[PDB]
Amino acid sequence: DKKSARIRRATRARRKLQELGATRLVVHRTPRHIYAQVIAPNGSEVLVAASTVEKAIAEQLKYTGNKDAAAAVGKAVAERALEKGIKDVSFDRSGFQYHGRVQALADAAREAGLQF
Amino acid sequence: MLQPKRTKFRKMHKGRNRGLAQGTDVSFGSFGLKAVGRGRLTARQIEAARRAMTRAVKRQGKIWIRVFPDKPITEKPLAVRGKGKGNVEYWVALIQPGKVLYEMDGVPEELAREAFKLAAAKLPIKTTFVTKTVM
Amino acid sequence: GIREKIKLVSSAGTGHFYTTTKNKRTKPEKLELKKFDPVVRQHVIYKEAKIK
Amino acid sequence: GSTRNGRDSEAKRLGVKRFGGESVLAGSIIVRQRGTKFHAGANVGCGRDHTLFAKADGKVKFEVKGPKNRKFISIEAE
Amino acid sequence: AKLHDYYKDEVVKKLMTEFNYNSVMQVPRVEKITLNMGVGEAIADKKLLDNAAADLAAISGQKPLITKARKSVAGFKIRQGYPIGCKVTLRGERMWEFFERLITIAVPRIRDFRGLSAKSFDGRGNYSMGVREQIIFPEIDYDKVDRVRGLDITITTTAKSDEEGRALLAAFDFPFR
RNA sequence: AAAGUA
RNA sequence: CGCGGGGUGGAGCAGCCUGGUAGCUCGUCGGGCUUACAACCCGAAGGUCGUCGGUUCAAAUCCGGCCCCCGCAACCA
RNA sequence: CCCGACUUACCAACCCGAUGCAAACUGCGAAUACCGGAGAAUGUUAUCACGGGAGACACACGGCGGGUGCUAACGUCCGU
RNA sequence: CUCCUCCUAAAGAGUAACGGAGGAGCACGAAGGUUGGCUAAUCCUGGUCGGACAUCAGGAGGUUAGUGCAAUGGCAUAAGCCAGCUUGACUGCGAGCGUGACGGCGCGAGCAGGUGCGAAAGCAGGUCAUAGUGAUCCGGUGGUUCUGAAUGGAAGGGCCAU
RNA sequence: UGCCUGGCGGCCGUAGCGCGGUGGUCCCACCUGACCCCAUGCCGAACUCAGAAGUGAAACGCCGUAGCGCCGAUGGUAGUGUGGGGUCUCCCCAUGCGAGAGUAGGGAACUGCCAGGCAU
Ligand SMILES: [K+]
Ligand SMILES: [K+]
Ligand SMILES: [K+]
Ligand SMILES: [K+]
Ligand SMILES: [K+]
Ligand SMILES: [K+]
Ligand SMILES: [K+]
Ligand SMILES: [K+]
Ligand SMILES: [K+]
Ligand SMILES: [K+]
Ligand SMILES: [K+]
Ligand SMILES: [Mg+2]
Ligand SMILES: [Mg+2]
Ligand SMILES: [Mg+2]
Ligand SMILES: [Mg+2]
Ligand SMILES: [Mg+2]
Ligand SMILES: [Mg+2]
Ligand SMILES: [Mg+2]
Ligand SMILES: [Mg+2]
Ligand SMILES: [Mg+2]
Ligand SMILES: [Mg+2]
Ligand SMILES: [Mg+2]
Ligand SMILES: [Mg+2]
Ligand SMILES: [Mg+2]
Ligand SMILES: [Mg+2]
Ligand SMILES: [Mg+2]
Ligand SMILES: [Mg+2]
Ligand SMILES: [Mg+2]
Ligand SMILES: [Mg+2]
Ligand SMILES: [Mg+2]
Ligand SMILES: [Mg+2]
Ligand SMILES: [Mg+2]
Ligand SMILES: [Mg+2]
Ligand SMILES: [Mg+2]
Ligand SMILES: [Mg+2]
Ligand SMILES: [Mg+2]
Ligand SMILES: [Mg+2]
Ligand SMILES: [Mg+2]
Ligand SMILES: [Mg+2]
Ligand SMILES: [Mg+2]
Ligand SMILES: [Mg+2]
Ligand SMILES: [Mg+2]
Ligand SMILES: [Mg+2]
Ligand SMILES: [Mg+2]
Ligand SMILES: [Mg+2]
Ligand SMILES: [Mg+2]
């Protein structure tokens, strides 16, 4: 199963981040959409979030499942995080390769101001 | 003469023999010979009693042996002083009170009683005749 | 105990050396590794030589 | 005759050195073990021989956590 | 491509009418075609494996993968990791082109050919057949062969049983006996 | 040079 | 009993050490020389290695028992 | 000839059901003992550290838990 | 006769016998570091040579595999399998702790300098761990801002590495 | 406010299997192409990218159902600390602690944060 394989792929880094007590920037990717959440060190409270299923973000995109959409989501999540005053997170690729849409989101968040 | 076909280890600690038995019900036949005492049953004894039983019933019915001699017993040869554990010489089953040792089926109760008495005369432990119970 | 002792000698000319072992029958090629030289306080190339 | 046995190795003094609720200083060994019968929790490290040791001052806490019902040792800050 | 279009344009409706499927996604599909050569003589001369791989590459239009022993076997004098075979996996356009070539050219050229067995199904709708001589493939020149070589062909199908697998294969006019 | 027996 | 060494074509003996089908001499069989036999010449066959277990992908081989044989030792009062 | 067709004095692996055994078995698991914290009473500080002086390092039997021996020894070797 | 693993050993440690069983006196510049990826045995069915067992495909199964070498404790976030880049198998130190009669032996965050892998958080002071060993003396080799029997040197000595 | 879905957790079988049914507006999944970023020790299978014609078939989620797994008393039994006793290899008495297995029975999880869709 693809989902179980990816969860297995992500577990080691997630356990390391929990042990380090870091604030996570977790990314989730589907063929149609991309999502980003900033999660508190306890792992059960979401501080900010942004995705292409939000109207305010999706209305400005030709397609919600490509690198341009990924960059828009990264920029939006970084701006909301900076508005909340977070500024310091660790990237959680969630078992996806650091590449393509995931990398474009991360680069947009870095450019917008998140430190990771 | 029963004895394990193979074992993990050749020799065993003496140990002890406390407690009451597990396996106190006639489970396979209709009649049983049950131990009332505590002790060891050698393979030779088990087989001497089996022979006595079987000849008494004229090889009719069915007989189960509920105990198996899985404990090896070592001895030191004569005129030896230490120097390592002795050699395995025979095999025993440890018996606690309540242990059903043999069961019989397919024969009348009187004949089973006679056969079991002849068998018990070969054994070093006191025994008693039991019958199957519904519960 | 077929493995033989060898030294790895700094290329920085300081005389500093590390020591280790090597299976000379299976790997005749000289061992070469970048290691920290505490005399010049830099990582440099170190090359195999006889143990003495 | 003679015996082919007669050998043994020295006892390794493994086991739990600090039990639940004990106050420890950072660095203290909590358990010595072969492999991870106990696992490292919060503020605990696992050394190269799988010794669990305190990474902060505090009180020893044992718990059972996770999907495998594994045993973890952590240090509660005091 | 021709056989893929034939599938999508006749076989889907044929199978839907035959088996009363409620969804087009339920129709059996040709997942992949795998060609294998068990070159057990390479342990004496590895160059034989090279020749077999060249033949497989010529037959399939694809670079083959050398397959090694999973474990040491005393009976065949092979140690674990010994290269003893070569395989090719065909999907998509390459699969369809090879399927068409095999159906329309190579199979009729089989020596004493009288139809393929319909019992060569593994129970889950996948088909396996054995080609005794590679010369049946026109991509192999009969004059330059140094040694006759066979192979195994497996057609892996998304069918759920042998009946659906054979129906799908026969919809392409597979030369069953 | 080496050739026993019936 | 203790310490060693062994057991492999019909006989005597190699190979074992150090894991990947094992050989020599005599003997046997078929042919040849002879009136015939012997001697001699040519050709061929014959053992999964004492018996079991274990290790090993694989054991004549390494390890552990069991049987048989040989050589030393089994003593002081 | 390739096949095959029956039958077992039969032996029966795997699996299913039922019955036991284990120092070097454990999908369970005590009593005690041990480590740590808190509290009262009691106890000639009974505790720890440093320093002056030693003796001792052949132990015995009895109870309990055991190895060995024959669940032999006023036997032998540990634990308490 | 030293070392390692199990049991005896009485659910903390330790615990004897000419008690019961097995191993070591190494191996590896990758079999070490790191990043990314992956998941076993066995059986059934179909398939050229190919057979009980080679490679191929599917299914069952779920670690019954694997671990450089004994045994125990571990291991899926794998410590098991594959590949890229590499030298942290770094140098100076070290809060604190374990274990020893002692000589000693072990675990260790963190600090300074310099380094590898990673986008990054980070990881790396050898290897899944526990055997693979030998005090002191006497000398050998290299280094050295130490010493240098009147003085300058030198010899010899010290210190550091071996 | 309710229903549905996705992500991250708590918890770690009363929560997992099996069997039956059911869902596509959205979401998810399969899916459509691949010259390209990237990739196959062969293969766009996987990874990756560009998309949205089709389908809920598979997967997933939800609902139902004890054939299993799982949980599980009360009582009794085993063992056992201390003191006493016997016919002392083994037991009994007073007191304190008290299983394991099995029985009755339970049982088709519960829950926090954020986001989206629909009704309202
Ligand atoms: K199929
Ligand atoms: K005793
Ligand atoms: K005593
Ligand atoms: K113990
Ligand atoms: K490596
Ligand atoms: K590597
Ligand atoms: K010390
Ligand atoms: K000097
Ligand atoms: K002078
Ligand atoms: K000098
Ligand atoms: K359930
Ligand atoms: Mg006992
Ligand atoms: Mg018992
Ligand atoms: Mg030990
Ligand atoms: Mg004569
Ligand atoms: Mg004399
Ligand atoms: Mg206390
Ligand atoms: Mg003394
Ligand atoms: Mg003494
Ligand atoms: Mg004494
Ligand atoms: Mg004493
Ligand atoms: Mg006693
Ligand atoms: Mg007296
Ligand atoms: Mg005495
Ligand atoms: Mg006595
Ligand atoms: Mg203990
Ligand atoms: Mg104890
Ligand atoms: Mg003592
Ligand atoms: Mg002592
Ligand atoms: Mg001892
Ligand atoms: Mg030895
Ligand atoms: Mg990794
Ligand atoms: Mg200190
Ligand atoms: Mg630094
Ligand atoms: Mg970098
Ligand atoms: Mg080292
Ligand atoms: Mg390794
Ligand atoms: Mg190791
Ligand atoms: Mg001298
Ligand atoms: Mg002078
Ligand atoms: Mg001078
Ligand atoms: Mg795709
Ligand atoms: Mg469905
Ligand atoms: Mg009760
Ligand atoms: Mg209970
Ligand atoms: Mg369910």
Residue D48 is classified by DSSP as T
What is the residue extent of each domain of chain E? 3-172
Cβ distance B83 to D2 less than 8 Å, yes or no, reads yes
B with D: how many residue pairs have Cβ under 8 Å apart?
7
Cβ distance B83 to D5 less than 8 Å, yes or no, reads no
Cα gap B131→C7, rounded to integer Å: 85
Neighbour tally for E118: CB within 10 Å: 14
Please report residues of D whose CB lies closer than 8 A to that of B84. 1-3, 5
Please report residues of D whose CB lies closer than 8 A to that of B74. none
User: Cβ of B83 under 8 Å from any chain D Cβ?
Assistant: yes
Is D2 part of a structural domain of the chain?
no
Q: Where are the beta strands (DSSP E) in C1-52?
A: 4-10, 17-22, 32-37, 42-49
Domain that holds residue D74: 14-78
Name the strands in the sheet holding D15-16, side by side, starting at the edge strand that comes first in the sequence. Answer: D15-16, D29-32, D52-54, D44-46
User: Cβ of B84 under 8 Å from any chain D Cβ?
Assistant: yes
Cα gap E177→E168, rounded to integer Å: 16
| Interatomic distance A43 CA / J1 C1' (Å) | 28
Is D7 part of a structural domain of the chain?
no
Cα gap E115→E117, rounded to integer Å: 7
- Residue found under tokens 């007989």: B63
- Supply φ then ψ for residue B43, to 5 degrees: -60, -40
Please report residues of B whose CB lies closer than 8 A to that of D2. 83-84
CATH class in words for E3-172:
alpha beta
Cα gap B105→B101, rounded to integer Å: 14
User: Cβ of D3 under 8 Å from any chain B Cβ?
Assistant: yes
**Percent of residues in chain B assigned helix, strand, coil, to nearest 5:** 20, 30, 50
> Residue E84 burial (CB < 10 Å; 0-12/13-18/19+)?
buried
- C14 CA distance to ligand 10 middle (Å): 19
Name the strands in the sheet holding D39-40, side by side, starting at the edge strand that comes first in the sequence. Answer: D23-24, D58-65, D70-76, D39-40
State how many domains chain D has. 1
Please report residues of D whose CB lies closer than 8 A to that of B83. 1-3
Contact (Cβ atoms closer than 8 angstroms) between residue C12 and residue C40: yes
Which residues in chain C have their C atom more than 2.5 Å from the N of the next written residue, marking a break after them? none
Cα gap B87→D3, rounded to integer Å: 12
Contact (Cβ atoms closer than 8 angstroms) between residue E68 and residue E83: yes
Domain that holds residue C43: 1-51
Nearest residue (CA) to C1' of I121 = A90
Contact (Cβ atoms closer than 8 angstroms) between residue B107 and residue B60: yes
CATH code of residue C15 = 2.20.28.120
Helices (H), chain B: 43-57, 109-120
Q: In chain A, which residues from 57 to 96 place their CB closer than 7 Å to nucleic acid strand J?
A: 62-63, 65-68, 94, 96
Chains A and B touch (3+ CB pairs under 8 A): no
Cα gap E151→E128, rounded to integer Å: 11
- Supply φ then ψ for residue E13, to 5 degrees: -70, -35
User: Cβ of D5 under 8 Å from any chain B Cβ?
Assistant: yes
Contact (Cβ atoms closer than 8 angstroms) between residue C42 and residue C34: no
First to last CA, chain B: 34
Q: Classify B122 as helix, strand or coil.
A: coil
User: Cβ of B18 under 8 Å from any chain D Cβ?
Assistant: no
User: Cβ of D7 under 8 Å from any chain B Cβ?
Assistant: no
E129's enclosing H/E stretch is: strand E127-131
Cα gap E69→B111, rounded to integer Å: 67
| Interatomic distance E103 CA / I56 C1' (Å) | 20
CB-side neighbour CA atoms (13 Å) of E36: 14
Chains E and D touch (3+ CB pairs under 8 A): no
Q: In chain B, which residues from 27 to 66 place their CB closer than 7 Å to nucleic acid strand J?
A: 38
B8 CA: distance to closest CA in chain D (Å)? 17
Contact (Cβ atoms closer than 8 angstroms) between residue D38 and residue D19: no
First to last CA, chain C: 18
State how many domains chain C has. 1
- C15 CA distance to ligand 41 middle (Å): 30
> Which residues face E33 on adjacent strands?
E90, E155
CATH code of residue A104 = 3.30.420.100
Cα gap D30→D52, rounded to integer Å: 6
- A99 CA distance to ligand 5 middle (Å): 24
Contact (Cβ atoms closer than 8 angstroms) between residue A105 and residue A38: no
Vertex A35, ends A29 and A36: CA angle to 5°?
A: 120
Contact (Cβ atoms closer than 8 angstroms) between residue D53 and residue D29: yes
Vertex E104, ends E49 and E19: CA angle to 5°?
A: 105
Q: Residue A95 is encoded by which pair of tokens?
A: 């078992």
D35 CA: distance to closest CA in chain B (Å)? 27
CA A107 to chain centre: 11
- Residue found under tokens 């508190």: A40
Contact (Cβ atoms closer than 8 angstroms) between residue E68 and residue E167: no
Please report residues of B whose CB lies closer than 8 A to that of D3. 83-84
Pairing of strands C42-49, D15-16: unpaired
Chains B and D touch (3+ CB pairs under 8 A): yes
Domain that holds residue A27: 1-116
Q: Classify E19 as helix, strand or coil.
A: helix
* Region for residue E100 given its phi and psi (left: phi exceeds 0; alpha: psi -120 to 50; beta: otherwise): alpha
